[PDB]
Design a protein around this ligand. Structure first.
Ligand SMILES: CCCCCCCC/C=C/CCCCCCCC(=O)OC[C@H](COP(=O)(O)OCCN)OC(=O)CCCCCCC/C=C/CCCCCCCC
Ligand SMILES: CCCCCCCC/C=C\CCCCCCCC(=O)OC[C@H](COP(=O)(O)OCCN)OC(=O)CCCCCCC/C=C/CCCCCCCC
Ligand SMILES: CCCCCCCC/C=C\CCCCCCCC(=O)OC[C@H](COP(=O)(O)OCCN)OC(=O)CCCCCCC/C=C\CCCCCCCC
Ligand SMILES: CCCCCCCC/C=C\CCCCCCCC(=O)OC[C@H](COP(=O)(O)OCCN)OC(=O)CCCCCCC/C=C\CCCCCCCC
Ligand SMILES: CCCCCCCC/C=C\CCCCCCCC(=O)OC[C@H](COP(=O)(O)OCCN)OC(=O)CCCCCCC/C=C\CCCCCCCC
Ligand SMILES: CCCCCCCC/C=C\CCCCCCCC(=O)OC[C@H](COP(=O)(O)OCCN)OC(=O)CCCCCCC/C=C\CCCCCCCC
Ligand SMILES: CCCCCCCC/C=C\CCCCCCCC(=O)OC[C@H](COP(=O)(O)OCCN)OC(=O)CCCCCCC/C=C\CCCCCCCC
Ligand SMILES: CCCCCCCC/C=C\CCCCCCCC(=O)OC[C@H](COP(=O)(O)OCCN)OC(=O)CCCCCCC/C=C\CCCCCCCC
Ligand SMILES: CCCCCCCCCCCCCCCC
Lengths: 181, 1432
């Protein structure tokens, strides 16, 4: 009877196929131990869809842009109730003075805007001076140095430096408003 | 046909395999499509996908699944496979959920291969964008009680099982990701009854493995700024908290609603929210500064600062849902746990590896709300059996039986507000090892931890740290005080000289007020107290040639201590090896540190071009001396003390200064210092001193004002106390009582002012067995002043300082003493012997490490670059500052009145102000000079005649030497170049032009000056005291305390240089330890009628001084003054009738009066000397023999190989001899006196008139008291004398000769008897000790102890290893120290046999004992070379 031979051949080949597939799957499962194999930080290593990976990469880029743009405003109404008398209040005033006097004033249609990445007072003032060459090169350098000395440098920063920075900012704004009526 | 059945079977195979192994994929596709559509996941930006699921097992509650992925924009949750069982066959116990009863686990979840990857925190960043109106960011991202109760009743216990799981924290913008992994997580989530809340959710479970680490992000663009981790475990990255098991219990109240009228309380009915973590075996728990930087980066990303001033949270009111108040964390270490701190110093991996015992817990309460004070979080760590070790060559750091930390950290509302850290440290029975390398290591660790990021005002947050360290139940600090800071790194039997400070309570407080942004100066104050039963113990290597001597001295000294021994310490309780020499009840040390913070100005993020940036910035300093120095105020007080004084105290103080505040701050193992090429020697030295890698402000100097005050010091002058006589009280160790010792050091940039002030000091000497009485010595005061002059010319910045002038001034007050003879003379002799032996320590002296042999230029003795410039070489040998500096010592002793009292004789030695000066650049000569100025010293003697109820004393003899003014010019030191004088002159005038403090170099005088005179700057521009120092004509005491109120004029004697217009000594009450509970009457009368009678007034009653109130030591000194010998005018007698290069006057005059009774009294003294000889300890004899060996440098005939050195010329003397006036007298029943007068002589060699006259007290009857007795002369004269050697009457004269010659013969016989007595005693006692040591089986008494690994580093190591007569003596020291029969020599013992009187037998006994000892000695005897000539 050939039917019995066909049946037994089918049974043995089916069992062999099943055991081979399940053994390969079991080997794969055993090898992929998540407590032994070091993972990858890449999002594409866990998410197969390219659209979701791209969306999350864009969200991470937006978060990094926010981190760059997230700058503390030291000169604040309730932050001056604190400090106020402490010796470092003057540099706190100075670091925000440049921002308030320039960005808060030059936030118009034709005014320049500080870049979100690589935010530099020196580079921003250079960009402004490129459009408006009336401002001397000494003015921008001195203003940038005053703000940088307030922010980072151990040299004595006091009311005199704050007054100098305010006078230079007033001169800069006066010339820039003369050039921008 | 076969084709049809083949097609059918192929279809069977395909369909069956697909439906049994691949239908899950299509079912998962369908369910993935359905789920995100029905709940709108894709619309809400959620990526969801299922790679496999089963539908046929629903009627068994089983739902298999595979490749389940869930991403919501913040974290990715991925599961490789698993199954979800709902065991519906388990009956529901109740209609409604009863939280108070047990429920079956109807829900069972198994997850295989769980991934959780947290890469973003969109909520906080969206909140920040909303609060800052960043509209651009907000658009680019493109973004029920009944049911709860029924579901929790239906599910019962949620059994969640995770075979393997990993948690990854990080994204593409973080350099490193936090990888947390575990295995075999079995957990049971349950809901139970909760007080004040809806329900309590508990998440218990265990994990059979857990590990956390920081792994490298592959997407990151690492630059040179990024720093690699100190250590990695292969691909796992930097480890953190490895463990073998973890048991976790997470509890969280499910919040309800407020029912009371008042809002939710902050302290009452708090919702429960806790977390418990119990760790098993193999917990390693590493960390470090690099891990801290990575933690800061990851946390700052995932928890960004909004820079918003917070507000006190509004507590929910009635009817509103409650909120969580705080979270409690409890971490328990159930086994022994390691806790390591790893950091990098250059290219070497350093570590602080600690350990804690089982059941060491960490508690952590974190407030989850904000109040009007902001928010805070607590911490309570407890480490049992906490043991710490370092990575240095000396790895021992710390150990205690319990360590408790209580930290409270408060954050105010404003993000910029001042934080407050309050940390309390508590130790129980803690012992520590302190080396200066530990301070260097911890400073490097702290600097690495802080980092190199620049300070930003927009990121600056002020904060104070309140540190309070407490040690209870005993503390112990061990300091390694090996000479030249050698260390033995052997784990066992470390042969290190160690000093341990022990006590009951130790305190340490330190506030860190970092409340200013880049302040010009930062001030930090430290306090440290040892508060009860404080002691100082000293240990020496067992075979160091100091330990046996010290142990013998301690065993044999008969000292009574007022301070009970301290039971504290852990490694210093072995009294046989540890010597407890100091005992006090309080030691407080205060530190006041003012410093300019070291800002790395190269890290300032300046976008301005450097060309114009330098214009605005101030010019940088070219030299470290151009900077304003830092400040450090040190204030140490020792409240009281009971001291076992010895020279080892001085030695240990010197080693402390060298190893902790001197050039030798760095340890050196005794196994590494093997370098012979100076080129590579300099290279290794250069690498450690990386001057080019540091800014100029790193080498900023520091002004230090040290004030050390030691109060109420009772010191035991340890010696070999004599033998005990049965009928007499044992003679104890002499005791010195000092009320206060004040030490002030004022070190500035260019000079240091060392000033030591001592109050009046007593010395009570115990009454001897002879019976004369107790002795006393009184010192009115002592002051030391040292002016060190500094310069930085041609000095390496690592040293940054060379000393070219060193002026010292010793001022000794009035010395008054009343000592008995010969006991107290012997006491002084052996006190000086032990003191000098221990201070010098010739066999204990060690070679300086080659890398530590600094020069005048800050480089090494060998391979010095500046000397290389001379003779045009790369490197040459410079010379040390000791050989080149100008040193000058001024010594002044206001007075000296010592009386030696015998039964029938006293001998008073009185002196005038004595000045001694040592000047190595005296006048124009730059060689060692000694100047002696003794205006007068007299010796008087009184002989007691007791034929009356009142004592009768006569001036038997007199002496007087006046006008001694000698200038000694010692030759140049041997092995010194011929041009040392020129080199020293150039060195001195090079490092002086900037200051001109040594005025004698710039004076325009033909004859230069010295600090011998006032031609130097000494504590001021004008040296007032030094101007008239050598002017002894006025005879004016120099120790007169006073206050000088001119800041430019130098301060007077006993006037603090730290304070202003204040004496260095303050009379303040302090703690002290109380006491625990001739032979013929006719001849003597005949001499009394002629010789001047005197009254002797001894001190009234020498008692034991007690400190009591301030000034009581002064009162004891004032009561026991010097003995007075008062002359009587009515009994005045015949004592007065009379008629290399060395320069100066030997003496102005030399008086001498002698009578036969005076020589009789000298005989009395000599006889008393010999009587006390058998009562002397043989140990002092062993000590003196050993002193001979060591002072000879062990120059045996066997050790002559080591001595191959290979004044000798130009010795000239020009001195003036005194006018000698000798007056003799002799009376016998009648009075004959002979007067000798030698006029002044001079040596170039001449003489002068000599008059010898023999008078005769013959009355005015035969051709004011004795008005009838003139003097009739028999004269004899010599006109002059020049020696040039350059390289009846009988009847009256007979009684004179037969008396003077008889007395002289008796004196000479007595002297010979004393000499032979001493020799016989020496031989007999040495033989006795040798025999007793030979017949001893005690383990400690042995020829050689240990391996003597430290002996290789000692000078004269080869010599002492081949003084076999000195190794044997060291064994004898060990016999005195440890043998049980050693107290067999504390008996007053004469010769055991009458045979020992004969010389030959007593010498042969000693020779035979030496022969017996030779075989035992020779086993370890290391012979230098070989002497076969002596062997035969
Ligand atoms: C290193 C090995 C890892 C071991 C992990 C140790 C413990 C870590 C775990 C903590 C598990 C978190 C418990 C579940 C969250 C608490 C439930 C919750 O609060 O949901 C909100 C809501 C209301 O609660 P409130 O407290 O009032 O809300 C305040 C703010 N939410 O809760 C509910 O209404 C439903 C209550 C049940 C929901 C909880 C889910 C039940 C099962 C949880 C098991 C978690 C499995 C994860 C373990 C896998 C291994 C990592
Ligand atoms: C009070 C109870 C008994 C105490 C028991 C321990 C005895 C320890 C004894 C003597 C040493 C104590 C002095 C400790 C600080 C030394 C002061 C000092 O030199 O600081 C200088 C240093 C820089 O010097 P250098 O690096 O060498 O370079 C300068 C030019 N070459 O400047 C500073 O940092 C200021 C130092 C701050 C003072 C605070 C130190 C507090 C003392 C700590 C001692 C540690 C022992 C405590 C362990 C006990 C545990 C059971
Ligand atoms: C061969 C005849 C078997 C009958 C056909 C059949 O029902 O196959 C479907 C079914 C798989 O369906 P899923 O829901 O995807 O289960 C996956 C894991 N539980 O296969 C089986 O259960 C039978 C297993 C073969 C036993 C031998
Ligand atoms: C981890 C898996 C274990 C699930 C345990 C969850 C406990 C059951 C539960 O409470 O489900 C909650 C949830 C509804 O939330 P509420 O209770 O109404 O409260 C939310 C705001 N009022 O119901 C569900 O989604 C069922 C939970 C899934 C069960 C399948 C497993
Ligand atoms: C996984 C590790 C544990 C996770 C537990 C789930 C977090 C949780 O629910 O804790 C409760 C906690 C307190 O909730 P409420 O008091 O109700 O105030 C919230 C008002 N918006 O929830 C949180 O707000 C913080 C969640 C982050 C916890 C980390
Ligand atoms: C794996 C590491 C084992 C755990 C080490 C102990 C550190 C630890 O987990 O601290 C508890 C930690 C800190 O407390 P809170 O932030 O206030 O809790 C808020 C919601 N849970 O709380 C946790 O639940 C940790 C979350 C699970 C982390 C385990 C992965
Ligand atoms: C946790 C176990 C410890 C038990 C309790 C100990 C309390 C721990 C707390 C505070 C210790 C103070 C160290 C950190 C304070 C910050 C000070 C600082 O960073 O300035 C460093 C400043 C400048 O560095 P230098 O190399 O000395 O000068 C060279 C300049 N060219 O020097 C220092 O202040 C040294 C800091 C160590 C002081 C002593 C440490 C504590 C003393 C004993 C503890 C036992
Ligand atoms: C019961 C135990 C305590 C009893 C023991 C009493 C000891 C006997 C008495 C007094 C000790 C002698 C006082 C020594 C004072 C130290 C003076 C000193 O060395 O200052 C110099 C030095 C300045 O030179 P540099 O810093 O290297 O150069 C900087 C250039 N930019 O000053 C310093 O460095 C810091 C000063 C710290 C000194 C504090 C330690 C004082 C020493 C001992 C006091 C306590 C003794 C207990 C330990 C005894 C162990 C032998
Ligand atoms: C170096 C001479 C030491 C002995 C001189 C000082 C001791 C004075 C007292 C005399 C009695 C001691 C007898 C000899 C003891 C070694």
């Amino acid at each position: 009877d050939g039917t019995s031979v066909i049946y037994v051949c089918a049974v043995i080949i089916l069992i062999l196929i099943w055991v081979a597939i399940i053994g390969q799957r079991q080997i794969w499962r055993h090898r992929h131990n998540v407590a032994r194999v070091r993972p990858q930080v890449s999002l594409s290593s866990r998410i197969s869809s390219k659209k979701a990976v791209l969306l999350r990469e864009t969200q991470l880029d937006t978060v990094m842009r926010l981190r760059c743009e997230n700058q503390a405003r030291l000169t604040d109404c309730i932050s001056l109730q604190f400090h106020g008398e402490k010796p470092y209040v003057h540099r706190m005033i100075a670091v925000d003075e440049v921002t308030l006097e320039i960005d808060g004033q030059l936030n118009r249609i034709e005014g320049a805007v500080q870049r979100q990445a690589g935010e530099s007072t020196y580079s921003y003032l250079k960009r402004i001076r490129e459009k408006v060459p009336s401002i001397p090169l000494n003015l921008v350098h001195r203003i940038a140095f005053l703000q940088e000395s307030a922010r980072f440098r151990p040299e004595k920063f006091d009311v005199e430096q704050v007054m100098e920075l305010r006078s230079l900012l007033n001169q800069f704004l006066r010339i820039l408003s003369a050039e921008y009526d | 046909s076969f084709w049809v059945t083949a097609s059918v079977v192929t279809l069977f195979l395909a369909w069956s395999t697909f439906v049994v192994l691949f239908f899950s994929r299509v079912s998962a596709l369908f369910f993935t499509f359905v789920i995100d559509k029905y709940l709108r996941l894709s619309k809400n930006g959620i990526h969801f996908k299922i790679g496999g699921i089963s539908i046929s097992g629903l009627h068994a509650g089983k739902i298999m699944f595979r490749n389940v992925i869930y991403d919501n924009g913040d974290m990715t949750i991925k599961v490789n496979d698993g199954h979800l069982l709902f065991k519906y066959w388990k009956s529901v116990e109740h209609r409604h959920l009863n939280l108070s009863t047990k429920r079956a686990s109807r829900l069972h979840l198994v997850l295989n291969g769980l991934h959780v990857n947290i890469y973003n925190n969109l909520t906080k960043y969206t909140e920040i964008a909303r609060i800052r109106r960043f509209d651009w960011f907000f658009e680019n991202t493109n973004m029920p009680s009944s049911v709860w109760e029924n579901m929790w009743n239906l599910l019962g216990i949620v059994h969640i099982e995770v075979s393997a799981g990993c948690i990854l924290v990080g994204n593409k913008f973080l350099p490193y990701a936090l990888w947390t992994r575990f295995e075999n997580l079995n957990s049971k989530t349950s809901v139970t009854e909760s007080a004040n809340d809806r329900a309590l959710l508990t998440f218990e479970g265990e994990t059979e493995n857990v590990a956390v680490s920081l792994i490298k992000n592959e997407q990151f663009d690492f630059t040179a700024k990024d720093k690699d981790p100190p250590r990695t475990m292969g691909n796992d990255g930097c480890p953190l908290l490895q463990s073998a098991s973890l048991e976790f219990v997470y509890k969280q109240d499910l919040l309800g609603y407020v029912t009371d009228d008042e809002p939710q309380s902050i302290t009452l009915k708090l919702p429960l929210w806790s977390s418990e973590w119990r760790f098993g075996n193999n917990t390693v728990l590493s960390y470090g500064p690099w891990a801290e930087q990575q933690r800061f980066l990851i946390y700052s990303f995932f928890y960004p600062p909004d820079f918003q001033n917070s507000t006190a949270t509004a507590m929910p009111t009635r009817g509103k849902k409650r909120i969580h108040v705080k979270h409690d964390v409890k971490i328990i270490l159930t086994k022994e746990t390691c806790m390591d701190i790893w950091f990098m110093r250059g290219e070497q991996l350093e570590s602080i590896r600690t350990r804690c015992g089982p059941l060491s817990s960490l508690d952590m309460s974190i407030l989850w709300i904000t109040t009007e004070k902001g928010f805070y979080w607590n911490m309570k760590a407890e480490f049992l059996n906490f043991e710490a070790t370092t990575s240095l060559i000396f790895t021992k750091l710390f150990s205690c039986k319990k360590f408790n930390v209580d930290g409270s950290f408060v954050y105010p509302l404003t993000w910029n507000g001042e934080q407050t850290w309050t940390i309390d440290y508590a130790f129980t029975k803690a012992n520590a090892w302190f080396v200066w390398d530990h301070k260097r290591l911890f400073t490097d660790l702290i600097n690495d931890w802080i980092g190199d990021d620049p300070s930003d005002i927009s990121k600056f947050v002020p904060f104070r740290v309140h540190n309070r360290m407490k040690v209870v139940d005993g503390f112990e600090v061990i300091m390694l005080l090996n000479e030249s800071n050698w260390v033995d790194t052997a784990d066992m039997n470390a042969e290190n000289v160690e000093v341990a400070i022990v006590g009951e309570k130790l305190s340490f407080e330190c506030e860190l007020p970092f409340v200013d942004f880049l302040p010009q100066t930062q001030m930090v104050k430290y306090e440290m107290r040892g508060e009860k039963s404080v002691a100082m113990r000293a240990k020496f290597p067992p075979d160091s040639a100091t330990a046996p001597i010290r142990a013998a001295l301690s065993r044999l000294a008969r000292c009574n201590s007022y301070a009970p021994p301290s039971k504290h310490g852990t490694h210093s309780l072995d009294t046989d090896v540890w010597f407890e020499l100091w005992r006090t009840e309080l030691v407080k040390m205060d530190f006041d540190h003012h410093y300019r913070p070291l800002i790395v100005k190269s890290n300032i993020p300046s976008d301005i071009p450097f060309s114009i940036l330098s214009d605005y910035l101030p010019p940088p300093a070219n030299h470290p001396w151009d900077l304003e120095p830092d400040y450090l105020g040190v204030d140490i007080l020792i409240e009281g003390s009971d001291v076992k004084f010895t020279g080892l105290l001085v030695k240990l103080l010197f080693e402390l200064k060298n190893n902790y505040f001197g050039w030798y701050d760095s340890m050196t193992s005794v196994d590494d210092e093997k370098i012979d090429d100076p080129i590579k020697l300099k290279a290794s030295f250069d690498k450690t001193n990386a001057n080019g890698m540091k800014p100029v402000e790193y080498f900023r100097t520091m002004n230090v004002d040290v004030t050390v005050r030691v109060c109420n010091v009772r010191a035991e002058m340890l010696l070999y106390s004599p033998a005990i006589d049965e009928g007499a009280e044992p003679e104890k160790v002499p005791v010195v009582f000092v009320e206060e010792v004040a030490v002030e050091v004022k070190k500035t940039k260019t000079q240091a002012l060392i000033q030591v002030g001592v109050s009046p000091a007593c010395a009570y000497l115990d009454k001897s067995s002879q019976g004369s009485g107790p002795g006393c010595i009184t010192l009115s005061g002592f002051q030391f002043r040292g002016h060190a002059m500094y310069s930085a010319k041609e000095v390496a910045w690592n040293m940054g300082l060379v000393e070219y002038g060193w002026i010292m001034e010793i001022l000794v007050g009035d010395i008054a003493g009343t000592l008995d003879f010969p006991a107290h003379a012997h006491v002084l002799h052996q006190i000086m012997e032990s003191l000098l032996m221990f201070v010098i320590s010739p066999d204990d002296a060690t070679k300086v490490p080659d890398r530590m042999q600094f020069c005048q230029h800050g480089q090494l003795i060998k391979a010095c670059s500046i000397a290389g410039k001379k003779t045009n070489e790369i490197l040459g040998p410079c010379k040390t500052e000791e050989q080149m500096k100008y040193r000058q010592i001024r010594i002044s002793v206001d007075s000296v009145n010592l009386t030696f009292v015998e039964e029938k004789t006293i001998l008073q030695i009185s002196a005038d102000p004595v000045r001694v000066t040592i000047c190595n650049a005296h006048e124009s000569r730059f060689t060692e000079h000694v100047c002696i100025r003794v205006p007068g010293i007299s010796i008087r003697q009184a002989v007691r005649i007791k034929e009356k109820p009142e004592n009768i004393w006569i001036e038997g003899a007199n002496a007087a030497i006046e006008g001694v003014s000698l200038d000694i010019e010692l030759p140049t030191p041997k092995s010194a170049s011929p041009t040392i004088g020129k080199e020293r002159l150039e060195f001195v005038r090079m490092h002086d032009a900037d200051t001109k403090r040594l005025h004698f170099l710039w004076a325009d005088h033909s004859v230069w000056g010295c600090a011998c005179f006032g031609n130097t700057c000494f504590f001021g521009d004008v040296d007032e005291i030094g101007s008239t120092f050598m002017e002894t004509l006025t005879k004016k005491k120099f120790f007169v305390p006073g206050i000088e109120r001119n800041p430019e004029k130098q301060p007077q004697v006993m006037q603090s240089v730290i304070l202003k217009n204040k004496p260095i000594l303050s009379n303040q009450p302090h703690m002290f330890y109380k006491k625990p509970k001739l032979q013929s009457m006719e001849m003597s009368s005949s001499y009394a009628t002629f010789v001047d009678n005197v009254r002797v007034e001894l001190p009234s009653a020498i008692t034991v001084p007690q400190f009591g109130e301030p000034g009581a030591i002064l009162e004891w000194c004032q009561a026991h003054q010097a003995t007075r010998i008062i002359n009587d005018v009515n009994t005045s007698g015949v004592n007065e009738v009379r008629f290399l290069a060395i320069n100066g006057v030997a003496a102005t005059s030399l008086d001498l009066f002698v009578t036969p009774i005076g020589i009789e009294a000298f005989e009395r003294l000599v006889t008393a000397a010999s009587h006390s000889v058998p009562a002397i300890n043989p140990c002092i004899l062993v000590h003196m023999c050993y002193r001979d060996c060591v002072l000879k440098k062990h120059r045996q005939p066997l050790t002559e190989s080591l001595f191959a050195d290979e004044p000798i010329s130009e010795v000239d003397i020009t001195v003036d001899l005194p006018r000698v006036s000798i007056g003799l007298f002799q009376c016998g029943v009648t009075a004959n006196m002979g007067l000798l007068l030698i006029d002044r002589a001079f040596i170039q060699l001449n003489g002068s008139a000599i008059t010898v006259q023999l008078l005769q007290l013959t009355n005015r009857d035969a051709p004011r008291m004795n008005n009838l007795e003139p003097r009739v002369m028999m004269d004899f004269n010599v006109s002059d004398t020049l020696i040039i050697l350059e390289r009846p009457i009988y009847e009256a004269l007979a009684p004179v000769m037969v008396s003077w010659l008889s007395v002289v013969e008796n004196f000479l016989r007595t002297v010979d008897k004393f000499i032979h007595t001493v020799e016989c005693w020496k031989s007999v006692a040495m033989a006795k000790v040798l025999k007793l040591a030979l017949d001893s089986t005690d383990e400690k008494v042995v020829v050689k102890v240990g391996k003597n690994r430290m002996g290789r580093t000692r000078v004269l190591s080869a010599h002492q290893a081949s003084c076999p007569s000195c190794i044997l003596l060291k064994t004898l020291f060990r016999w005195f120290a440890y043998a049980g029969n050693a107290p067999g020599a504390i008996n007053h013992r004469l010769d055991i046999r009458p045979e020992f009187e004969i010389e030959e037998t007593r010498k042969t006994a000693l020779m035979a004992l030496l022969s017996h000892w030779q075989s035992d000695v020779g086993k370890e005897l290391k012979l230098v070379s070989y002497e076969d000539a002596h062997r035969f």
